[model samples]
Target chain A: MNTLQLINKNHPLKKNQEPPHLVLAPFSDHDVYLQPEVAKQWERLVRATGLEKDIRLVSGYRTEKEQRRLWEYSLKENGLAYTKQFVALPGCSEHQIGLAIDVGLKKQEDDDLICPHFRDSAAADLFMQQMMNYGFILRYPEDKQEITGISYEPWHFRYVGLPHSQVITAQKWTLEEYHDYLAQTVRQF
Target chain B: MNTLQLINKNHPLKKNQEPPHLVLAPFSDHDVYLQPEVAKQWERLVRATGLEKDIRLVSGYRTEKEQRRLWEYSLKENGLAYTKQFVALPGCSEHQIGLAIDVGLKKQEDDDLICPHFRDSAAADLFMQQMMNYGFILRYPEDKQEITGISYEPWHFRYVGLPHSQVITAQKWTLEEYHDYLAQTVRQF
Candidate 1:
């Protein structure tokens, strides 16, 4: 519903906080679903990229139970230090909001769920170049990990929507940074 | 943008009254454009129909100029009496609204624009039966021609959206009748 909502460890989604107008993520792969706006935007990006065969949806809307299990699984498999940097703590994950989408580029099925391989493929590179035009920005860039409390994830993209996504992409700023600026601007008036 | 607005000869569109959030009609052909809600709903119907090869959009969003030209052409070709029964007088045409769609079943391109042949094909019959589930109703039916002022159009469909489309389908009511009933109910209060 609210694409620009700051959902993270500091701004955790409330208990059973699900977004409205949820629909099946418009893709040909893994059981991913998203809000209509997000899905349409994603479709636009996919249409522009023309890399349907090589690239696929890695993740979409996540349930509370799935995120809880994912958090614990990451903690056990990757250990505390790695999990803390990579995985969100349950409700903190953006996947629950139906706005966040993670794309994977792989020919074979493998256990690269949390950490998806996106580089090497030319198709992935093409998709990366065009994602911003369709209202998406890499959620966690390589350098912004310190502020975001998440490690660099090239595969992850969030639908911030419209002129804001372009501005955010141009500024090389996180969603937090953009929202923070808006909050500050409103207070100034 | 108001899908329920009763646009007819009696209720003509204002000058340059274009709808918002207009997008490419999300089809393989026809140079059609439509509002996002209608586009998405149309896609759902196509996906459900699985008659992509046979059924295709005959008409979508029409500009005032296109409608005017079409009306004149129909009048000259079909004569005064036939054109009045068939062609909408410019601003009264639902094609301008983007929610109205006329689908045709054709293997070859032909000049059957105003009167598309939709009844002869099995795909057409299937689409007719399934369209209501996707928020579409036959815009004009044979029995309702008197109230509608337009003759029965097997090809033309209008999107009313949600439970209302289903209800209209069940009641076999025109959009005019539905809006009239709504006005009556509001006046009763």
Candidate 2:
């Protein structure tokens, strides 16, 4: 992943710039797709789970239009104050990269929608442990909210692959910090 | 549960109108709330499920803003023609009523957003059978697409409460048909 291509509040995607290696996740609805490697690893993770049911993919690969709607909705329902904390502004959502997934425990409950309670689930703890092994990271950990400009989201996982995920998890670095470190240390050296 | 307050394309709630008996569902994130009775029965239904972690709630209550955003995004992504088939227009979604839920089966895969495949699942079959008993109804059955003006959505369930749900399921009537029946024959007499 190109660290410079980071899409955030400050770094928005250039027009028509999206991941080129996108593929429809076999287990997802036709509308959902992700980068091929991301999808493959996600499949592996799902199958590897010894649990009777697979983890739920609450959301993935949202289009710009969808992101815009979410932005507009957040503004309306929560106003700017709450929306800024809760919903991603348009063009800022990681879902555009086709590498982000909002996950949920596949529990036998009406409340299976992605929620913070996931952090308390046995499955969630196990799943987060496995995320790094499968080339993913908890995109927004509780402690790094200030650095990430996002709140704690136990359910949102982002695929950065391999050493990056391992390093991010071990170092307790938000992607912003990781990118800064790369630019300052790796690139300079 | 007034039958006349059906939130759909033809009959939408007035601006800002929402159920007053709302309560945040325990199983969901703080953002997902529903009418108290609706939430209570949903929890009951989950406990009643014999299958371990089989049912999933992909979506629950949506504020008017969320519904509007969905409507706008659908229109932008799929255009009016396709959006009409898939997304409800603004102010018309059943979700605003805090009584509708989009459900999924927690199968060992990623594809459970909203699809017909749920009909094949043991949990779905069992849940649908048990829905009426808990004051819920399969909002969109396969056979009643023409009558409901929506295609078969095996995942969407609506809370109509007691006798209404039982009567609708037993007579195989869409909520549209039920409303019409109540308006003309049942109420007229």
Candidate 3:
């Protein structure tokens, strides 16, 4: 939140700038990672909700190299058009910023995870309402998919920190819109 | 792999023993990892065949707690019957041992990672042949599914090290069968 780092297909990172202290996810085998501060807040959010045992971290921070690899592979296996709709081009992912996470709900019956259907759960509904309190926002709401340039993914969340999250949620703004709004306004502080 | 530590549904670890030098997958978002030794060889395998940029490591090690979490989640979400077919019971997954990996082929058009069609690829087919030299084995061959108590996963590989991988591949033996064979005969060394 220090910088309204607007990164998308158009806005890439400045050379040599990396996200903050990368830390491991809570589970041992999960290759996922997050910023240390974000991880701390996520731990608090999980614990406070009494959903620690049921929640799963499906995705976290990503590197540019990995992004490119996935992008090329998707392009080969799927097709240019299909890759565009789903996979972000390298360096354009919110995951590269270390503040985004793809959340999952652990169910008792299936091994498949990172489920888009997670939105149907009461736990997820509660999380949607409570995440604003933790400075996180559901990144791609179904209503905002057109602006977000992605399909509705209930699993994705982004941490913008404090008043920004509250404001984004209150105004029902996509990150793109929020960036524009902030650019035109002066902070009272 | 070095010690032939037998672990399965029935043969659980005595409390607190884990693999050495566990490392995360290269992608930041994936919640998967493997022992460093296994990961190093995997790097070699991917590079030599030039699938380095296209291959995806879908699943790696799992701790007991993680196993249970996934297990219960699958059961609740998919129902017990589906869970039995797809999800491993807690304390029963080879993933807990850190020697196994589930590989995937990335496609530009689709987001699916656990591709069953991978077995048909030249890259995978060549890797299947070359892996034994690197002390890795295609853990579940189609014909050996009954002995392994798992479905044929062409993408799953396990590092058993040395002559074991060679022997397992050459003799068409599943790990279970290999275990029994080893028990019946003394090693020449």
Candidate 4:
């Protein structure tokens, strides 16, 4: 396993510095973080899609500032409506971990996907569903308002590692249930 | 483990069911099939929230007519230039397998929560982050249109089960990765 080297704004790795290729936009520092393996997995996912467009992970790892911007925007959205729930800063934001990513598919170079296709985007859904096999889970499901305390977000994904992904998807429990179960069952250091 | 049972429409499960509590909405049948355990997890997440209002799960195990209504609503929404990805129907819907759910939190005492805390409600966020502990995964996320192929939906959850949730969340990997990992490593007949 790769030593857990953080790819944060302040501690950007020197060797693997190409600015991560085609970043979309908006996500400043607060929206990027990735385990080395995950970054590679993303590359694999993008390639597997066989999508012609230059789809890029705009925000893979996030910084506090970027996360703050997201919260500010969410807060500004209809007047700080979801400010409480929307990710505002580093510790609270998932991007800080580098597991969550914000990606952009070039519509012109990519598929002329319509908005509705998201629900039934055979390619998109298929692609993401396939990602589950890789040990990633989409964070922020739609119906989990009570648990997530935020509105539904389909784009976000969290990497919990392997073996566990298998158990969770097979069992049909939410992260909330799984976490609770684990916390009660295991004594983590 | 509880043997999975099917309860058709107007069946005892539905009789005076008054809509079992919902933590999400816009669940389609297809989504249900993909993840059957979501229905139960959604309930638990909702209850965990302990919100004062009574929440109901609509679109759980949707029938043909109900699915049609949802689609029709989508069609109308599309007419107004809304994204078709927002709503799916029948085979394409997520509520099919009883895996998905559509939530409604409101007391018969009130029309609905017009409180600023609606989807973006702070209290709601706290409760939902709690959902992550369970195994539910969000379907569509915000702005990451390239990945999910859908827009932001703050109320959908898929029960990928256990360890999957932990792995995904801990690693911060996207659902795409999770699906891929599972298909490659853990999937079995």
Candidate lDDT values, in order? 0.76, 0.68, 0.68, 0.45
Candidate 4 docking band: incorrect
Model 3: CAPRI class: incorrect
After superposition, the stretches of candidate 2 with alpha carbons farther than 4 Å from their true spots are A1-189, B1-4, B26-32, B75-80, B112-116, B186-189
Per-residue lDDT of candidate 2, residues B30-142 (tens digit)? 13456778878887887776644676555666656556555654566568876687667767888877788777655434453334256777788888788888788888778
CAPRI class of candidate 2:
incorrect
Quick one: best lDDT, which candidate?
1
- Name the candidate that leads on DockQ: 2
The residue-by-residue lDDT of candidate 4 on A26-83, one tens digit each, is 2111112365667656656656666424333434554343345444444554355545
Q: For model 1, how does the per-residue alpha-carbon lDDT over B1-189 read when each residue is reduced to its tens digit?
A: 677778788899888675544555544332245667987899989887887777766566665655775676567667889889878998898777788887776453332546776786788889978898988999998899888999999988998787878888899899989988888999989
Q: TM-score for all predictions?
A: 0.49, 0.55, 0.54, 0.37
List native contact recovery per candidate, as a fraction of 1. 0.00, 0.18, 0.08, 0.00
Please give the lDDT score at residue B61 for candidate 3. Answer: 71
Better of 2 and 3 by DockQ: 2
- Model 3, A8-112: lDDT tens per residue? 777776657855556655521234567766777787787778776566677777666546655765666567877786667777887887888878765522322
